Every structure is written in structure tokens, then in C-alpha cells.
Design a protein around this ligand. Sequence first.
Ligand SMILES: O=C(O)[C@H]1CCCCN1
Lengths: 112, 113
Amino acid sequence: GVTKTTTQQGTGPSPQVGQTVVIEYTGFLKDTSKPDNKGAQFDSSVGRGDFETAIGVQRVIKGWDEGVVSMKVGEKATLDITADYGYGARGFPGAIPPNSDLIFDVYLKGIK
Amino acid sequence: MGVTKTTTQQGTGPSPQVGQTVVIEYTGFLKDTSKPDNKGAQFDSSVGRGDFETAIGVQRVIKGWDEGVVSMKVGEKATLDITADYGYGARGFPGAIPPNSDLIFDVYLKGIK
Ligand SMILES: O=C(O)[C@H]1CCCCN1
């Protein structure tokens, strides 16, 4: 469903269901012909500011819910998220095509 | 209930029925009742690019569009006031649509395949 790659190990606490996480992130459409399978960037907190959400309660795609609760504060990770754990067959109009596997760089900076 | 349609240009072409592919031009806003026409931040628009083509009425888009668009005629422009229940519900697209966001869409039905 979601495959994680740790590019920086974190050692703080690991978010649990219902906690508000603070993350920096960049989202990419998956393109296996590209380095690290990163195709077009569709979204990013960078510049916008750190993104906050309660995790594990389906306020974001399942791939984030599942990926981010497996992280530890301080961890930088890449989440490879299959379409059905992302925006599935519907996609998101204007942003993400139907059935798009997704690649996210996620930086877990804290828990509220 | 969840979706109220204000027709802003009457259309006279055919009307979609469930499962037909529709071709629409749209602009999406977060609803903001302290703004004119209830239109808060614009998060998306197909104006100036390709139309959005989709089967209508089969939950491939938010229910507000499934109900709203099938009540339209080709050529019709309409403002769709969509509650969270008929929009993306309790999920959000980060940076664009918070969870449980009411939505306003300007929709323009330009064809049925
Ligand atoms: O833009 C926002 O506020 C976020 C909240 C968490 C879910 C996604 N949308």
C-alpha cells in the first residue's frame, strides 16, 4: 500500500492515531523512468509553511496516515504510495490524474 | 439539501443522464459566507485549459457534481453551492481544501459524449 524509505533516521516519538503531526512535504506523481521515481511535483509545503494535521483519522490519504504513523519525529522519509492508497480511481481534479501512484518526501518535525 | 444550483446562463442542448460522459469547465472555491456570492479561496479552475471530462452520476466526482451536472443542459452555466457532505466530506487535499469544507463551483456544461 505504502512503502517507506528512511533517508534520515528520527529518534523522537512516533505519532499515534489522533495526534497532530507537523510535517514538511513534497508530493510527486510516480514515474519509474525518473530518478527516485519522482515525476511531476504536484504539491509541497515548502515555502507555504509547515503542514499540520491530525494523523490516522482519514483527514489525508491513507498512504500518509499509514506512512506518517510509522515515522519518528526527526525522520525524513520517502513514501511510495499506490494509487488505491492515494486518490485512487477518482484522482483529484486539477491536481492528480486518476490512478496515480504517488511519491512523497516527508519530514516529521514534531507532534503537537 | 447538500447541493443548491443557481443557473446563471440557460442552456438548450441535451441534459446528461447517469453514466454519460460530460465535458465541463469549472472554477472551485472554498465557501465563505462573508464574501460576495459566498466565494472564498479559489483552489482550482479549468478556465483556459482543457475541459474536465468524466462519467457523471457514478461517484467519479463529488456528489454535488453528480447531482448538479445531471440537472444541467449543455450550454448552461450554474453556480453549485455544495456542502461538505456532497463535496469531499471529512477528507481534505492539503493546502487546497480543508476537511469538511463547503464548496462553491462555477460550472459550465459544454458537452455530452
Ligand atoms: O489544508 C488543510 O488544512 C488540511 C488539513 C488536514 C487535511 C488536508 N487539508
